[PDB]
Amino acid sequence: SQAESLPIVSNKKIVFDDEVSIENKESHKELDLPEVKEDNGSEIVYEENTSE
């Protein structure tokens, strides 16, 4: 049918998330992170983990 060939979103999302996850992970793989100091005298550290 016509409405039977409407895209079933969740199933398409699987493929689309996979290729985006791969793409995004590889982009970040050779990113280059630049030092940022405050006027304070303070390096700013890029980490998402207060592991105290």
Partner 1 sequence: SLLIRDLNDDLSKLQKDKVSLEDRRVIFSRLMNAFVTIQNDVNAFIDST
Partner 2 sequence: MDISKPVGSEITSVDFGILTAKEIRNLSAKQITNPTVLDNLGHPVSGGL
- The residues that touch partner 2, with contacts defined as CB under 8 A, are 16, 20, 23-24, 27-28, 30-32
State in angstroms the smallest separation of the CB of 3 from partner 2: 27
Residue 24 touches which member of partner 1, partner 2, none, C-beta under 5-8 Å by kind: partner 2
The nearer residue to partner 2, 13 or 44, going by C-beta atoms, is 13
Instruction: Give which of 44, 42, 22, 21 is closest to 33, Cα–Cα.
Output: 44
Q: Kindly state whether residue 10 participates in binding partner 1, applying the rule CB under 8 A.
A: yes
